[PDB]
Amino acid sequence: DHRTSIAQALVDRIAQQMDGSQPDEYFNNLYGNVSRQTYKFEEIREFPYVAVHIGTETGQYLPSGQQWMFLELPILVYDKEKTDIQEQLEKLVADIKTVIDTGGNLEYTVSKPNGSTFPCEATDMSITSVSTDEGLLAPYGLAEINVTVRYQPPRRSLRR
Amino acid sequence: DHRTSIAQALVDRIAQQMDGSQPDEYFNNLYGNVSRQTYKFEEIREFPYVAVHIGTETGQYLPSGQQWMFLELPILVYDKEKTDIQEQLEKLVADIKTVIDTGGNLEYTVSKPNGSTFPCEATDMSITSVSTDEGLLAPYGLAEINVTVRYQPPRRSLRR
Amino acid sequence: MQIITAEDYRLYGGLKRPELESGVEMMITAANALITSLLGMDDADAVDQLINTKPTRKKYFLSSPSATSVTKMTINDKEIDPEQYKLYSDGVILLKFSPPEGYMDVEYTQGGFNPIPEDLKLAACMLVDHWHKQDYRQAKTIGGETVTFNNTKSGIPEHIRTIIEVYRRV
Amino acid sequence: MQIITAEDYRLYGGLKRPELESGVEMMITAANALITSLLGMDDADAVDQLINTKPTRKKYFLSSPSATSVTKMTINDKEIDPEQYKLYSDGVILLKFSPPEGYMDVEYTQGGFNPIPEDLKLAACMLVDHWHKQDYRQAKTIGGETVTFNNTKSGIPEHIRTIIEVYRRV
Amino acid sequence: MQIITAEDYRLYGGLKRPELESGVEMMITAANALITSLLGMDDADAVDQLINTKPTRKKYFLSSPSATSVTKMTINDKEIDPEQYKLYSDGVILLKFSPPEGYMDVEYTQGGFNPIPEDLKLAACMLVDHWHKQDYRQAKTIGGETVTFNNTKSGIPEHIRTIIEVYRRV
Amino acid sequence: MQIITAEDYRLYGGLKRPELESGVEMMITAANALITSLLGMDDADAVDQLINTKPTRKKYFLSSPSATSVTKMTINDKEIDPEQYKLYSDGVILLKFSPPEGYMDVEYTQGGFNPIPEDLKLAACMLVDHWHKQDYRQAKTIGGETVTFNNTKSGIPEHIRTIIEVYRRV
Amino acid sequence: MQIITAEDYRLYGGLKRPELESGVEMMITAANALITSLLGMDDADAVDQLINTKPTRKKYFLSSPSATSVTKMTINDKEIDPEQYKLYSDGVILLKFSPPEGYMDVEYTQGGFNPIPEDLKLAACMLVDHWHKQDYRQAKTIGGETVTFNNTKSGIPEHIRTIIEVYRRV
Numbered sequence A, B: 001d002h003r004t005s006i007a008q009a010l011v012d013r014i015a016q017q018m019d020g021s022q023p024d025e026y027f028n029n030l031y032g033n034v035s036r037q038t039y040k041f042e043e044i045r046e047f048p049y050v051a052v053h054i055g056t057e058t059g060q061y062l063p064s065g066q067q068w069m070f071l072e073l074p075i076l077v078y079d080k081e082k083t084d085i086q087e088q089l090e091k092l093v094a095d096i097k098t099v100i101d102t103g104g105n106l107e108y109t110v111s112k113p114n115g116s117t118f119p120c121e122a123t124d125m126s127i128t129s130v131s132t133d134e135g136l137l138a139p140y141g142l143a144e145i146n147v148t149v150r151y152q153p154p155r156r157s158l159r160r
Numbered sequence C, D, E, F, G: 001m002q003i004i005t006a007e008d009y010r011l012y013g014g015l016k017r018p019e020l021e022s023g024v025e026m027m028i029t030a031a032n033a034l035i036t037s038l039l040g041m042d043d044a045d046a047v048d049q050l051i052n053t054k055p056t057r058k059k060y061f062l063s064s065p066s067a068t069s070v071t072k073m074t075i076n077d078k079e080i081d082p083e084q085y086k087l088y089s090d091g092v093i094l095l096k097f098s099p100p101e102g103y104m105d106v107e108y109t110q111g112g113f114n115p116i117p118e119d120l121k122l123a124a125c126m127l128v129d130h131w132h133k134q135d136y137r138q139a140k141t142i143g144g145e146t147v148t149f150n151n152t153k154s155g156i157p158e159h160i161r162t163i164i165e166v167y168r169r170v
Helices: A003-018 A085-101 B003-018 B085-101 C006-013 C022-038 C118-132 C158-167 D006-013 D022-038 D118-132 D158-167 E006-013 E022-038 E118-132 E158-167 F006-013 F022-038 F118-132 F158-167 G006-013 G022-038 G118-132 G158-167
Strands: A049-052 A057-061 A067-080 A107-111 A117-121 A124-132 A140-151 B049-052 B057-061 B067-080 B107-111 B117-121 B124-132 B140-151 C046-053 C059-061 C069-075 C085-088 C092-095 C102-109 D046-053 D059-061 D069-075 D085-088 D092-095 D102-109 E046-053 E059-061 E069-075 E085-088 E092-095 E102-109 F046-053 F059-061 F069-075 F085-088 F092-095 F102-109 G046-053 G059-061 G069-075 G085-088 G092-095 G102-109
Touching: A003 A049, A003 A067, A003 A085, A003 A107, A003 A140, A003 B085, A057 B124, A067 A085, A085 A124, A085 A140, B003 B049, B003 B067, B003 B085, B003 B107, B003 B140, B067 B085, B085 B124, B085 B140, C006 C022, C006 C118, C006 D022, C022 C118, C069 C085, C118 C158, C118 D022, C158 D022, D006 D022, D006 D118, D006 E022, D022 D118, D069 D085, D118 D158, D118 E022, D158 E022, E006 E022, E006 E118, E006 F022, E022 E118, E069 E085, E118 E158, E118 F022, E158 F022, F006 F022, F006 F118, F006 G022, F022 F118, F069 F085, F118 F158, F118 G022, F158 G022, G006 G022, G006 G118, G022 G118, G069 G085, G118 G158
Parallel strands: none
Antiparallel strands: A049 A067, A057 A067, A067 A140, A107 A117, A124 A140, B049 B067, B057 B067, B067 B140, B107 B117, B124 B140, C046 C102, C059 C092, C069 C102, C085 C092, D046 D102, D059 D092, D069 D102, D085 D092, E046 E102, E059 E092, E069 E102, E085 E092, F046 F102, F059 F092, F069 F102, F085 F092, G046 G102, G059 G092, G069 G102, G085 G092
């Protein structure tokens, strides 16, 4: 299953769209401060920063070899005051929600034990909820995002 | 009931298929590091390793001597970094899920108080869920798998 | 004295923002001065020192062991000449004559470290991180994660202090 | 002095990323210097030492027991010749004559370990891991797992310190 | 000195992977050296020792009780002959004459254990496991299971230290 | 010295696997040697001992109380004959003459226990279990069950140590 | 010495399995020997003892108070006759003459308890249970039930030790 490759693909999509080519479209540039494997808060030395975490993956079988799988991505957006922090977080969440809900379905490249990588696409992908920090620390603040994805694997049991 | 004999049969099946005869089919060789009776984490000195645990067994009676029984097998896959650990675990889980969902129904040999062993077969056998470690320890990581099995015993109450 | 500048911290952190915030750059500028001072060095070039002297004693210790050359010495405002003494490492002067009792006045240039050792450069980076992340706390629990901080000593975080003490003069 | 370099750590860790990050390589470079220094060695080749001497005493101990050959010795700036002494292991010199009272000045080459023992090489790898994983904490609970760290001593993690003390000079 | 090699650990562990990882093999190589050193042995073959001697005293103790034969001894660089002494077990020499006062210089070959006892071989295996599983912690709770580790002493896990102390020289 | 072998452990445990794993057999071989050594016995057959003697004293204690027969004794390399002494249990020799002052050298055969007592045989089995189950921990909680281990003493589990001390020599 | 055998334990436990496992039978055989030894008795029949004697003293205490008859006594290898002493309970001999100074050598038969008291027989059964159930732990929680074990003393469970001490000799 494609849990890491999907997280990688979404990280790539965030970096590509945020980068600066959409200046009247996204409030920010991240300069590559979005990542999958460097996410513990001690690790972060720049702000803003976007950390992608991988949730539980679940499955659902269907009558003749098909199956759905569902993934959660908890996303954390860490930021530091310059303006009031709740307005900055509102900007970053608006940007990342736009990047979620616009453009095509998320493509990811499934690397294979034969050495190939097969280009595939997540069928449906949906942000569900947002929350924000109480504001006790300053200047640091945080917003949670919960993302859900549904995708279908290769049709394993009938290819075999 | 066949709780240990089923666990033994699945251990045998994992060792037999993983062994190396499927080199463009399974990512790994286990060299017999899959077991049922040597599973406490202190016991393991090699990586990867696959530990089979035996869940609760439950029953369900049917109108004329038939009964279903259901078994859970919690499976633990222990592994140690060489590549990033989440990719290695993704390989091992892909292999073991293939070994679950391909090939025939699991055969097991029921040893009998008369001294015989009768070859029998688990009717339906199904992996349900997977989870993975948070990654705090390194280089060690872990993945959970939950397996379910349904099987029917000998028709005890009508043979008697 | 500069133990680090912006590029050194940028290498250590791996920062790819195009610039530092004024916070980090001020913290770097303070960190240079503080580590300069906790070692007991100072950034003066030429130093003047007044020493009590007695005829029984002819080893004298300069105030800063990185002293590289004496450039005047005099006793009771009677000047004496470079044949009358020898200057050894760690700022030790050995008189070749037993001195008149009273005050000795000496000028010397104090030099410093060269090159700055990599362990000081690291300790400075860790101090800048310490102030920048505001890790002068005993615990935090933002969200679900949770950490407990070092048992700091002299108010300096314990994991920094070993590197200072390996060099702390006197 | 190099106790480890990148290939030694790569063997210990089993790393298959094509390169180390600058973090690990700096930490290796600092670890070499720190373990060099906590043993009380130094990386100088030729050493000069000044010793107080008395006619009652004719064993003298050099400042670094790995000293491999004396190359000058003199008393009160009167030079003396290699027949007048014997040099034994651990930097012990035995005078074959009772010396004039006063200061002895001696030059010697200090050598070192050879080959570097495998236990130091391991301890260095464990120190690099200690800084790299940031295990200078008392506990962590990320997710569900949880660990409690060693009762560190002199701020050095206890499981490292035994290997240092087995070699810590003096 | 080798207390264990790869086959000994492979027997103890019951490993059936075709080879050890470089981690285990380095840890074995360090474990040999550390246990060699904590016993206070060393791996030299011929040893030279200098002893202060007095006419009142005629038992002298060699520096390593596994010493197997004296091969030269001399007093004040006056050589003396094997009839003039007797050499007993645990490196005890008994002089058959009361010596001139001063320094004695002696060469001897120090031998060692033979064969290496099985308890040391086990303790080495347990130390390799200790580093390999990273059991230098106070507790862990991965998943549901949970363990608390030994009250280590001198930083050596307590269940290892008894076997060392049963042999720890002096 | 063998206190147990594989059949003794097989009886105690009730094992019906056809063979022991190499783990258990190595642990048995180490357990024999360790319990041999903690009692302060050794496995030598003939022993040589050197004793300081004085004319005021005529009871002398042999180094191992299981000594079964003296086979030579001599004073100042003057040999003396078996009528001139008496040898009592626990390795006590009583001289029938007041000795010349100086060193006595004696050879004796040290024997041992016979038969090995069943309590030592049990304690050995419990030690093998202790290492084999890895019960050198303070607690475990695998699944739901939970245990807390003994307050070990000298690092030896307390329930073993009583049986050792009932025999621990000196 | 047998305090219990299989039938005694079978009565105490109420066992109706047709036979004991080898575990229980070995534990019984060890328990006999251990309780034999902690009382400070031994299983020898005839004992030989050597006593320092002085003319000022004429009560002498035998080494084992169950001694039932002296069978030889001699002083300086001069034999003396049963009219010259009296033997009282608890192994007290009273000389009817003031002895020559020096060593006395005496042979006696030491007997024992008869019959073995029921409290020792019980304590042995409780010790066998203690090892058999493996109750050398501080706590257990298998399933829902939970127990905490005695504060053991000298490593002997406290509820056993009172019965030993009521008989522990000396």
